[model samples]
Target: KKFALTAEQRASFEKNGFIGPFDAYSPEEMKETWKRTRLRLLDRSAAAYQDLDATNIANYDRHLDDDFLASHICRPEICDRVESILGPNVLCWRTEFFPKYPGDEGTDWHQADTFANASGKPQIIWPENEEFGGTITVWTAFTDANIANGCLQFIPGTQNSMNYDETKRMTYEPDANNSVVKDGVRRGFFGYDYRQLQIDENWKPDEASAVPMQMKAGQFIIFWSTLMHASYPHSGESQEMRMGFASRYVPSFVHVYPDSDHIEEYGGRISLEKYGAVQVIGDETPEYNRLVTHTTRGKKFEAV
Candidate 1:
């Protein structure tokens, strides 16, 4: 079936910075994909098994796996919708498998731009211009997302208005705040504490339009790069693994990496060589670019 987004859905994305329940992979497919993901996490040959933490261990380079490509990452419907806004040329910039186990801590309330700054572009372009095609991030849920299982929460419309200020931002010191430690790990690592950040008093955390993104196994949520979103700690004891894949898309012209070292850190050697040649679309092509060229294959990126 050819699934497409409705105008209301796109408007919700533009106004609140996110739209969800986009049809994605099936439950059976997701089950198989998760099986491979779990195996990859334990397989020494796999690149992801090495990265583990208090809450979760992720394999960031799953694009190298064939099982992942077949089951999850390379869905045409997702690419088409993203391309509608970002243009035909797109690149699968990063992929990470996030599995929050029981008793895991939540993520901080931080903008994605903080990490994306390695690209050297403004995190959120208020009045988006042609120079920088607005970057969109599609976060797919491989399991049911709920408050108990550490589902994502967002501060409505904060995508364009908020910017992370290191100075005014609360320090990660446990002594400074009582909400610092939950489930034994510091909360800062998990997500930003919205309560700590000073904003207009009219905003109430209870009524901050915080909604639980309850998605089925195959559903996905797409959000702007600058959206102020965070996940809560998993309070459920059930072995319900919450698997998610995040694919970032930008216009063909934007440089994949503005800083060499930052590119090296997240992308590694393969990224260096594949940086420019991966994808290219649009009419006006820029010079000194490596990734954009026309071809019959089109720009298709699949996570392995």
Candidate 2:
């Protein structure tokens, strides 16, 4: 595949902590695919999570049930680049749907090292001596992402240090916290004020240095989950919402959920009974994490 990152690209990725706006599919193709997939998603018969009330978690890991999504998670366009960063032994442990409707608040600036910011417990744990503990996220735009509609923003080189402590508590109350403004931007972490997790109450993100990552439909970008990242508020200039599909990749040795059997985040909790990481590449599947080669509906993953 022509998707592997070149040496220069990899160097830039190392320096900036992110890369891309690369094409996985043509805009027209993506639009058509999304049109069909959107409808297919409505019928959640074989979805990995059976939770009916989980806000964001409800759409988590649909790749384990939806055929297109199952194929999507393993696409060479995404996997090859991810492999360049995470090594050949890569596993896609989670996938999420981030939808920003018009008038919705932006996601607060934050970094997720253990992904315990909201749940107050680690979701992904790295080896004891590993230098990092975050996953590589490949975020694909399901719709055109512009400044008007919530597009992601990143502070370059912020991946190595964390400003917020994930083990801290963050209260979830969507109605009360969703519209709170921080530094003049209406942003929140789903329902929780990300400020609650700050290592120091007075510290603030360098907003002036942030870069907006506007993308066209069908384009994707890869970045460390620990990179200082957030999104712009949907300006409501357009009636359509912006959609981004994020597939998180980590090396085989990592413990995906550690000792957890359920995910408690974004105001929802669900069992991990049907959850298993998809090894997108490599012949080695570590004994640490559960692996799935087929969707819940019996569709094989990467049948090639």
Candidate 3:
């Protein structure tokens, strides 16, 4: 019941496909926590996917090893609102770190349905009768995020339809894809061009209607992965970069990874042999999903 959303907030989320810049940790507290946690993340001996070459893929799923992230994924401030939409049973299937340094290109305007745009396979599959197929993502601002520092941007109410086909293949050429400029801004989707999966090659996102989501260091925002989302390029006006911690959630019935043993995308590959979804607000995990009761360091994952 803690941190439950009010009726108005719930309705807004239903209409906009996203909500919050909600307070989780105090600014001072989050600053200190991130300072300590940043150092701990360097030693990834216990990370779920080990032996990976240096790439953005290495930033995936540290909640399985790091105590701060393990606790973070189950934070009441995040789980309560997520449960409002996903019902009582939910699983934190994945967590990723997104960092944008000064002059770094913005993220591509995109929406993920089955999350197969990059890997060419469905990462998560909801029941056929369900109205939607994307996961709910709780994105926390680990650093001050604003227009100058690459905060997220969204097109309201775009979550119900598929603008891009996930089954389509995207060519991966980091050298070629990373320098692209779209609509007057430098942007890219990691190493692959997200536009490759667009159902209509002539169609483009409505940029003028997009809204920026600026948040303080300790705040968080929740949105469906199917919402049209992107970020601005860090404008070099500030010496510091923006950091975002994203934890992805889905109901227990949805299959996470759906029979895949490894993840291959973003110019790198890693085996999912040690991967297990964390149950944040649920009493039991269904048989279709792999659940972890403790971190790799032996810390029990008690739900908040």
Candidate 4:
């Protein structure tokens, strides 16, 4: 039953493009995972723990850590279900950890497909024959994800199409350089400018229409790459409710970015060697290239 997803669950995922409240982990498991995550965060050498001073942190480099790798990639139940949809061969192309501290403004409203297409790949292709494939983002909640804690909010079934124009994507200016290592990792530059991505007033996120994915610790929700999703500012008294995300990508073929610098900006350092790679039947040779790296600078924020 570990690998089995209920028909109702499958239907929800198909129609609404997401399924949540899958199951809660035991209290012991939750505590252990949080403990391990904190340990990783405190370890400066850990690629996932950035020393950045930004109001919000995007630690995409953590897949290299054993704690993160084991939790997302090594979990057979998660991988099995993903393989069912993406076929036997797959790769965890990217991983991101979204930690919203108290009073932290959430990420901009956007589509995962927008970021995926930024890699300069085909828009649509049959998964069976494609080499560089699309992605499926599985968001695992390490803490309780709720509205007060800046939990994820999405427009149901928005994954069906790209309703917004790509030109409308918002862009943030890179943060000024700063040197502050958290644990051991050096901080990085970061900033945000989301005015361009604004949707029509009618489509703006409202409490009544927005589906808040309130997940218990250890439970996860999976959605298509194109789904429209965003999070609200963290207004909770405790910062522990922030979530952890494990985003997996299935490339259709061997994808290699000639420029390593650009790869780092968009994707974290390729850590497949430590995390292992997933391959499909048509895969001729496994590729572990095109890694995304973390930033070395931090950001400064005003009080909320």
lDDT for model 4 comes to 0.52
User: What are the per-residue Cα lDDT tens digits for candidate 4 across 1-304?
Assistant: 3675667767777788776655445546876877777666655564433334332323554554544443455355565566555555555656667777776665555564434233342323333563332367778788777878877878888776664443453343444222223223222223433323444534543335567787777877777766767676576577464866665656434343323322222323232233233332224433434332212222111111
Candidate ranking (TM-score, best to worst): 3, 2, 1, 4
After TM-score superposition, the amount by which residue 200's alpha carbon in candidate 1 deviates from its true location, in angstroms, is 11
Task: Summarize candidate 3's per-residue lDDT along 121-217 as a digit string, tens digits.
Answer: 8998999986778999999999999999899999999989879998889988889987499989889988888999999999999889999999999
lDDT, candidate 4, residue 67?
A: 42
Whole-structure CA lDDT of model 1: 0.54
Off by over 4 Å in 1: 44-58, 114-134, 166-186, 190-207, 261-304
Local lDDT at 247 for model 3 = 95
* TM-score, cand. 2 vs. native: 0.97
Lowest lDDT 10-residue stretch of candidate 3: 50-59
Cα-lDDT of candidate 2: 0.90
Candidate 4, superposed: residue stretches over 4 Å from native: 44-58, 114-134, 165-169, 174-190, 194-208, 239-241, 251-261, 264-304
Error of 3 at 31 (Å): 0.9
| TM-score result, candidate 4 | 0.68
How far residue 280's Cα lies from its native spot in candidate 2, in Å, is 0.2
Instruction: Assess candidate 3 and give its TM-score to the true structure.
Output: 0.97
- Rank order (by lDDT, best first): 2, 3, 1, 4
- Segments of candidate 3 deviating more than 4 angstroms: none
In candidate 2, position 45 carries an lDDT of 84
